[PDB]
Amino acid sequence: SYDRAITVFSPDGHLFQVEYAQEAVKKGSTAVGVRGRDIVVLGVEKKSVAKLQDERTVRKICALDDNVCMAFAGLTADARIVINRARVECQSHRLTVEDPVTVEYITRYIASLKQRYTQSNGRRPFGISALIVGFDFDGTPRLYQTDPSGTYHAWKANAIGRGAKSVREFLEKNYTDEAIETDDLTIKLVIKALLEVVQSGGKNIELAVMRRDQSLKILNPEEIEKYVAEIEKEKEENE
Amino acid sequence: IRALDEGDIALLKTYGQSTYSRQIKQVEDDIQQLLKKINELTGIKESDTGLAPPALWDLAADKQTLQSEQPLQVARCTKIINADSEDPKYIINVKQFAKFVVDLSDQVAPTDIEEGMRVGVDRNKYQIHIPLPPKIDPTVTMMQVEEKPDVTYSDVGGCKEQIEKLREVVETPLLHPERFVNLGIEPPKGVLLFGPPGTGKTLCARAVANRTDACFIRVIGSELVQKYVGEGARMVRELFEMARTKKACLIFFDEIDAIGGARFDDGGDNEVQRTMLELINQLDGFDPRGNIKVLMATNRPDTLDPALMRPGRLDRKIEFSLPDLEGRTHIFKIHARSMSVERDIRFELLARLCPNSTGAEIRSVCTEAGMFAIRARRKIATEKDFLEAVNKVIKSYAK
Amino acid sequence: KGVLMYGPPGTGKTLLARACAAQTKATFLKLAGPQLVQMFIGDGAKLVRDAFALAKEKAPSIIFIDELDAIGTKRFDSAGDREVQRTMLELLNQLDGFQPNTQVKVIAATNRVDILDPALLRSGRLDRKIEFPMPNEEARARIMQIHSRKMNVSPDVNYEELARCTDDFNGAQCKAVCVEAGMIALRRGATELTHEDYMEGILEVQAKKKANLQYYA
Amino acid sequence: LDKQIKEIKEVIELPVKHPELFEALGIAQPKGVLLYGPPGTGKTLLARAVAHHTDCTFIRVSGSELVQKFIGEGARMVRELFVMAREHAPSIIFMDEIDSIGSSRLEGGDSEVQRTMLELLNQLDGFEATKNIKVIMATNRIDILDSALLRPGRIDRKIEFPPPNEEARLDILKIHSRKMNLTRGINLRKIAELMPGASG
Amino acid sequence: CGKTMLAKAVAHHTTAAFIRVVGSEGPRMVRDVFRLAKENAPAIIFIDEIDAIATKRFDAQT
Amino acid sequence: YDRGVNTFSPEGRLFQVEYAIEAIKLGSTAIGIQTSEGVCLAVEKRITSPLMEPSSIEKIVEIDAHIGCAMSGLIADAKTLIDKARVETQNHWFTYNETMTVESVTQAVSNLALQFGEEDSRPFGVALLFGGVDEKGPQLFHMDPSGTFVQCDARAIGSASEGAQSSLQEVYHKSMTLKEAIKSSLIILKQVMEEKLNATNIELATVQPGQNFHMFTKEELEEVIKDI
Amino acid sequence: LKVVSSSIVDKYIGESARLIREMFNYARDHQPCIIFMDEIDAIGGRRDREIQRTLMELLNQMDGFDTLHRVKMIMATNRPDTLDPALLRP
Amino acid sequence: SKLPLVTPHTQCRLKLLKLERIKDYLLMEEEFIRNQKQEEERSKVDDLRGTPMSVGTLEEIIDDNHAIVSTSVGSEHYVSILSFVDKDLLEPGCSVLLNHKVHAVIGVLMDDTDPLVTVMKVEKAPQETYADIGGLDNQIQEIKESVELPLTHPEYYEEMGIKPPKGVILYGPPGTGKTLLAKAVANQTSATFLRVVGSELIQKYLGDGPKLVRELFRVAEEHAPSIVFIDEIDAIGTREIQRTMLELLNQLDGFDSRGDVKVIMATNRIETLDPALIRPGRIDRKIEFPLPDEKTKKRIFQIHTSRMTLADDVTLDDLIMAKDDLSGADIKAICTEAGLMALRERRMKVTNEDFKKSKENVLYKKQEGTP
Ligand SMILES: Nc1ncnc2c1ncn2[C@@H]1O[C@H](COP(=O)(O)OP(=O)(O)OP(=O)(O)O)[C@@H](O)[C@H]1O
Ligand SMILES: Nc1ncnc2c1ncn2[C@@H]1O[C@H](COP(=O)(O)OP(=O)(O)O)[C@@H](O)[C@H]1O
Ligand SMILES: Nc1ncnc2c1ncn2[C@@H]1O[C@H](COP(=O)(O)OP(=O)(O)O)[C@@H](O)[C@H]1O
Ligand SMILES: Nc1ncnc2c1ncn2[C@@H]1O[C@H](COP(=O)(O)OP(=O)(O)O)[C@@H](O)[C@H]1O
Ligand SMILES: [Mg+2]
């Protein structure tokens, strides 16, 4: 009994179609998220804006809460589907529950939706993975990752997509156990990887920041290039 | 861009050229031509035929024997006419040449020749004078082990009961037939060895080969599976008659699962099944098998044909399992016996450290300790070395 | 003029053929199915025809074609095996076709009668189909007595109980029980084997104890 | 095909006719070219003419010839074809409709198709004895083909053969009418204009 | 209707040799058929009820 | 006989659920011990990278103040089964006010598990250990994708189940103190399973009848680390 | 003339085709005659080499029947499906 | 024999001087050769074997100087053996010289059959070297410890008591340098090299798979110190093909004693291979060939563009950077494609823009997915 299906097991017992979903995630572009001392920062790469393709429309970064933000790496159609579902869920939870939304609940929601969609015949799993950053961890930053197997884990700093093998090791090389003083330092550190992954072009670092109390914050390419120049000065020290 | 014109090529293949390339090109070309000249001058390298050391051979005996004897042709004998038991008149079937009715020379005797017999025959009167040994297939005749593998029973660890059961059938009746005969019991004549790969099956086979005195023949799947139909069955026939020629013999079919596959029809391989049926018929069919003891090892006991597992063909089935703690300590002792190691190595600690590791794993970990040591250039392996090896191999399996 | 003997491996078919060859006093041709197939293009049918011709030339003759499962198999198989088909067809028509063949009796043995042709399993060729079943319990006791005839058994061996333990045993497995009891008596060094040795042999021969069939699904 | 013919002169002819540059450049010679276009667009004709001018030998095997009915036969055919080409001095290997054995196979027998395309790719990748040995591949409608052979270390270049235009129709009509007895008052240009989108 | 009949008649009257294969009878077979044609220069090849192999093309599955 | 559970083998076995057992085998190892002092469970995280929060992998959980759990397998739907167990305890206690017998909790989880060919999906490819205390006895129980379930004294599931089970069987007896059971289980885990104990990959949870609080082990492992 | 078809088969190169040709020549020489080849599938199966080359010779000798010979032929088989459709042609 | 290695490559006076020294020595060889008994042993042996002498096949040896011999006509002859024939060089299947008149056995002819593995014997290993491969330092050490050092220096292992490792698996993305390392280790120790690439052992006949494996290992034993490189072990390794696996596994770790032959296998898809094929007792060294990192990629660029004439402006580092997405084979393709771009513009001396365009085009030769 070979894989050939979603709801059947090979004699080993692993659902290879879930593996195919995770490889479908692997074929997507880079996405590396972190949490800092107080703030959470993100920068997406591989914009590859081709002239008439005005880069704003595709919306590489989506903020779906009073304050929470992420798009989805993989195939973007299911990304926007989970976007609509996240909008509905966050607004409905804020309306119905005695207290507003927390990042843990919404991450569990996404994981459960992915699992429930997967757990049936004739229903394609979302081949999409995401990195969620939220503020209301009792007023503290925390980062989560969601995987098409319907799984959710917590990270101090994680990378998924085309750089998953590389950037993660980069993080394992330099994620300071010292809580990042001057969260702009964490922003420079993450911008370094977000650039170096895509040829450090300086054009696709498209970035968002939230200090775990603020609403959504965005970084324009010039202000991000400021952190890029600081990182270049830090790297030039070896002389 | 316009294509590279001949003038463009000519300009390009120079100018950028150095001030030596012309001379150096003429030098390498002359090197090549004069190397051909050396080859021609030295001529063709001599090809020999093998004439032994000169002092060893010749004497007038060789040429005298050449001019005096007869280079006999080889024939099958057939249909001893024996029209009166006084003028026997045997038929011969000299292969690829002819068939003749012929008589004996003055040397050989009627009791010497039988039907078949692969006789030898003179070249111009076709008289019969030599009894030649029968035809044995060269692949079948090389199948005999000849050189005894160096591993003995004492080099097998943990399998006390399995080795005891195996030696009861394959070794004891040959060594001490009086035990069985004076007690009036017929010993079993077939053993199957089954267990996970790398558990030691072939190893205890080699051990048997050591302690064995009678003829030992090695068989693997590829030996019997020919492309031609019935030829594998033919090989099985030749193998068993060769074994019958010996005064008692052992046959060992490693990887019997290669051909022992159970019969299936609505699908099959069939020809492999035909060879396996010939093997079954030889093992236990019409006519006594003889003093031919049989040993087979397989990684798949269930896959073999049910007729092949049947007692009388595989009387005793021996299971080799992943060793227990004591067995793991014993195999560690056995493998570290040869190695250069520090004295007080607590082998039981590693043995308990081992997960469900086959004996092959123990050999591999010992070799890995040896390699770490030789990489460090130290002449003695240490406990830290063995721990590092244990890790290496277990994480390598874990991947 | 045709007797096909059949049954699962371990009943005694080959033994029956051997006994029939013993107390007959006639020309006996013994062969297996793999002997007939051979490599060359026309030689297998030649072998079958020559065997039958020899049987005629020594008219009181019985041919024991053992392992008929080899040459005999469903015509359309799986095909480069058609040589086996032709040899088998020569056998087929050397049993009943055109010229009759009398005074040449044929015995055949197979374990896989489902595999065989609907042709060489006919009624004109193999008139008698003799089933060899699993030995019944008095049959098992008789078999153990037969094989332990000369092993110097104990004066009290409860063969009936052995038959009760040895369900699903074939006759060869009963002989295996006997020889295993002898070997176990040798391990004890006992000059005569007894009932406990037979129980231990039954444990040795029987099976693989299956597995955890409540974990199963 | 003048543009296409010029590209294929460059890539094939230059290493075979003037290897010294690639020695002076040091770079290893390019191995082969894939040819793709609608069926009938002179691909075999172009390969045959290139082999004729380059003075090296022409060996052909269509992809459909490779398949066979038995496992281990496509591999043997490819390996012995490469042996023949190597034994035949400077040579170009031509394989028409290579897409027949190079296509979407991940759908899932099919085993021998992969064991053939992988073997061909192994023969060309190992640059086996590629002293003046070249290969040429032809495909109808490139899209059905797979990238496994076009991967950079493998076969190096692609050439497109669109349907002949008005000027190309003029040539081909002239060439194939050169032997036919034509009559004054003929107006072949109207004929070429009247045949839009011919495949040659 | 006489499709093979007239072909046979033509083969008899002319110096041609008449080789026939029916479409129900892979590519190696076609290669051998045309090669066996090549052995006799004026020989004729005939495909009987060809349509089975020459059916309209599309994306083939198996 | 490959498309699903609704096909029977010649030997009757369904060629779908044995693959779910092997799916148990691909998961992280998990251990459970039943003693008259307290019921304990242990689990290996397989923390892919320490940059993860080790507590994030919920391979050790608390269903309720009297009952904790561990699992091995695909993990993803194991959390769903824990959710069902928690809703079971909540509903039954809020309605009847009598404590849910851990036997009954396992029975309810089994009733959920029997919903792949028994109505109108696929078996939950994961196995579970439950450890609980109740007014009538402290118990430990085991659950597998087939929906069958058994009371055990010393249980092990997941990868390396056989060797860990053998050692756990050899160390067990009926009158052990929970301290000796915990130490034996931990040293077994150290020798066979991965490596020396540390807070970022091992987890332990134990429950006692008179204790409805802190059914976990957390931020106190140091004493063991120096004294294991 | 009665024939077990497998009897036609011989291992020498091209001997079986000669055997079939000679059989039909004996048929023509000793009229009136009836040729009964039985178990035809043995040499009449759908298209190991020599059997096909011999079926070709059987086809040629069969088609060589002029209207005048007093020669007729019977073929018997138990698996007519396996028979080559070449024989099935009128 | 072959000419020595000339290892300046730029056209300089040093290269010419080395070639001139080679020229001088070869000219002295010319001079020496141009500048220019055992008739009793000849008249004895080479006249007993009176010309012509036929060639046949030895079947069996029955007595001390009597053997059974076949010939091309297929006949069989029992004929004596004259004393000068080396007995230990005589075995069944051996090609043997025979006196034309009385078929006397007059010498073994060194084998000229079994042509498949005969051509399989590479002997053309010297195209690569450890120098030619750059950056595989850990893998170089692994292969050295595994296959090379036991062949070059078995002394350490015999002194220590280790039976050295004698089977290795190489795995990683294609074009990372697996075959390169295999050929390089074949060159560094001059033990003969045998290659057989995966699916080519798969055959239509029932026999030729296991038979091919058997004769391959037989010839490997015959050459004694030998390397058997199973490239694309995948195709066989991932009943008949399983039987070929069984024969290969038995020939790796089975009965008899295998001897000195080393076995190196290469795969792209290690995780898919059958666990039996990777016998942890036998396949004790698994070696990963990951995609080259920055230092490696620099080394590969240096070695491959070294033989190239270069302009001043090339910014080699900026060529490397990126996110290590290209293996060594892709880098060689970059080098060749940049050379072609330079040639198109008529530069016999490549520039930076050539490499930039080359890398951009080669990277364009990747991926097909839209979202
Ligand atoms: N009824 C019986 N009486 C005596 N001995 C028996 C009996 N049944 C079986 N045996 C013994 O068991 C064996 C039976 O095997 P036998 O040679 O008859 O082949 P078989 O059962 O027909 O097997 P196969 O079909 O594989 O050839 C013999 O060794 C015989 O001594
Ligand atoms: N009980 C044991 N004692 C000593 N060495 C062993 C034992 N079991 C296995 N080995 C070692 O592991 C290897 C196992 O090979 P083996 O299992 O005989 O191959 P196969 O599985 O093909 O029969 C042998 O080379 C042997 O050296
Ligand atoms: N430009 C051309 N000039 C002359 N003849 C042509 C031209 N293009 C095609 N042809 C004719 O049409 C045929 C094209 O064959 P080809 O394109 O190789 O077919 P396929 O596309 O199936 O490979 C040639 O044999 C040639 O005779
Ligand atoms: N580390 C390296 N050093 C030098 N060349 C390399 C390296 N890695 C790959 N190559 C290039 O790749 C080719 C070898 O690819 P390889 O990985 O051996 O093929 P395969 O994937 O079929 O084993 C050679 O032409 C070589 O130039
Ligand atoms: Mg029998």
Swiss-Prot record, chain A:
Glycosylation sites: 129
GO terms, biological process: proteasome-mediated ubiquitin-dependent protein catabolic process
Places the protein is found: Cytoplasm; Nucleus
GO cellular component terms given for this protein: cytoplasm; cytosol; extracellular exosome; nucleoplasm; nucleus; proteasome complex; proteasome core complex; proteasome core complex, alpha-subunit complex
GO MF annotations in UniProt: identical protein binding
Subunit structure comment from the entry: The 26S proteasome consists of a 20S proteasome core and two 19S regulatory subunits. The 20S proteasome core is a barrel-shaped complex made of 28 subunits that are arranged in four stacked rings. The two outer rings are each formed by seven alpha subunits, and the two inner rings are formed by seven beta subunits. The proteolytic activity is exerted by three beta-subunits PSMB5, PSMB6 and PSMB7. PSMA7 interacts directly with the PSMG1-PSMG2 heterodimer which promotes 20S proteasome assembly. Interacts with HIF1A. Interacts with RAB7A. Interacts with PRKN. Interacts with ABL1 and ABL2.
Family according to the record: Belongs to the peptidase T1A family.
Protein's name according to its UniProt entry: Proteasome subunit alpha type-7
Record lineage: Eukaryota, Metazoa, Chordata, Craniata, Vertebrata
From Swiss-Prot, chain B:
Annotated positions of the N6-acetyllysine modification: 95, 399
Protein name, UniProt field: 26S proteasome regulatory subunit 7
Keywords attached to this entry: Acetylation, ATP-binding, Cytoplasm, Nucleotide-binding, Phosphoprotein, Proteasome, Ubl conjugation
Endpoints of the signal sequence: none
Similarity-based family: Belongs to the AAA ATPase family.
Keyword presence, Oxidoreductase: no
Post-translational modification (record): Monoubiquitinated by RNF181. Phosphorylated. Dephosphorylated by UBLCP1 which impairs PSMC2 ATPase activity and disrupts 26S proteasome assembly.
Gene Ontology molecular function: ATP binding; ATP hydrolysis activity; proteasome-activating activity
SMART domains per the UniProt record, alphabetical: AAA
Predominant location category: cytoplasm
Gene: PSMC2
Function: Component of the 26S proteasome, a multiprotein complex involved in the ATP-dependent degradation of ubiquitinated proteins. This complex plays a key role in the maintenance of protein homeostasis by removing misfolded or damaged proteins, which could impair cellular functions, and by removing proteins whose functions are no longer required. Therefore, the proteasome participates in numerous cellular processes, including cell cycle progression, apoptosis, or DNA damage repair.
Keyword Cytoplasm appears in the UniProt entry: yes
Cellular-component GO terms for this entry: cytoplasm; cytoplasmic ribonucleoprotein granule; cytosol; extracellular region; ficolin-1-rich granule lumen; membrane; nucleoplasm; nucleus
SUPFAM superfamilies in UniProt: P-loop containing nucleoside triphosphate hydrolases
Localization, UniProt: Cytoplasm
Curated annotation (Swiss-Prot), chain D:
Binding site for ATP: 37-44
Positions where N6-acetyllysine occurs in the chain: 69
Superkingdom of origin: Eukaryota
May mediate interaction with PRPF9 as annotated region, ranges: 33-200
Annotated compartments: Cytoplasm; Nucleus
Protein family: Belongs to the AAA ATPase family.
Role noted for this protein: Component of the 26S proteasome, a multiprotein complex involved in the ATP-dependent degradation of ubiquitinated proteins. This complex plays a key role in the maintenance of protein homeostasis by removing misfolded or damaged proteins, which could impair cellular functions, and by removing proteins whose functions are no longer required. Therefore, the proteasome participates in numerous cellular processes, including cell cycle progression, apoptosis, or DNA damage repair.
Assembly with partners or alone: Component of the 19S proteasome regulatory particle complex. The 26S proteasome consists of a 20S core particle (CP) and two 19S regulatory subunits (RP). The regulatory particle is made of a lid composed of 9 subunits, a base containing 6 ATPases including PSMC5 and few additional components. Component of a complex with USP49 and RUVBL1. Interacts with PRPF19. Interacts with TRIM5. Interacts with NDC80. Interacts with PAAF1. Interacts, in vitro, with the thyroid hormone receptor (in a thyroid hormone T3-dependent manner) and with retinoid X receptor (RXR). Interacts with ERCC6.
Protein name listed in UniProt: 26S proteasome regulatory subunit 8
Taxonomic source organism: Homo sapiens (Human)
From Swiss-Prot, chain F:
CDD domains per the UniProt record, alphabetical: proteasome_alpha_type_5
Keywords, alphabetical: Acetylation, Cytoplasm, Glycoprotein, Nucleus, Phosphoprotein, Proteasome
Residues bearing PTM Phosphoserine: 9, 49, 56
Description of how the protein assembles with itself and partners: The 26S proteasome consists of a 20S proteasome core and two 19S regulatory subunits. The 20S proteasome core is a barrel-shaped complex made of 28 subunits that are arranged in four stacked rings. The two outer rings are each formed by seven alpha subunits, and the two inner rings are formed by seven beta subunits. The proteolytic activity is exerted by three beta-subunits PSMB5, PSMB6 and PSMB7. PSMA5 interacts directly with the PSMG1-PSMG2 heterodimer which promotes 20S proteasome assembly.
Phosphothreonine modified-residue sites: 48
SUPFAM superfamilies: N-terminal nucleophile aminohydrolases (Ntn hydrolases)
Lineage: Eukaryota, Metazoa, Chordata, Craniata, Vertebrata
One of the protein's GO biological processes: proteasome-mediated ubiquitin-dependent protein catabolic process
Entry similarity comment: Belongs to the peptidase T1A family.
Tissue expression profile of the protein: Expressed in fetal brain (at protein level).
Residues with glycosylation annotation: 185
Protein name as catalogued: Proteasome subunit alpha type-5
The keyword Nucleus is annotated on this UniProt entry: yes
Highest taxon in the source lineage: Eukaryota
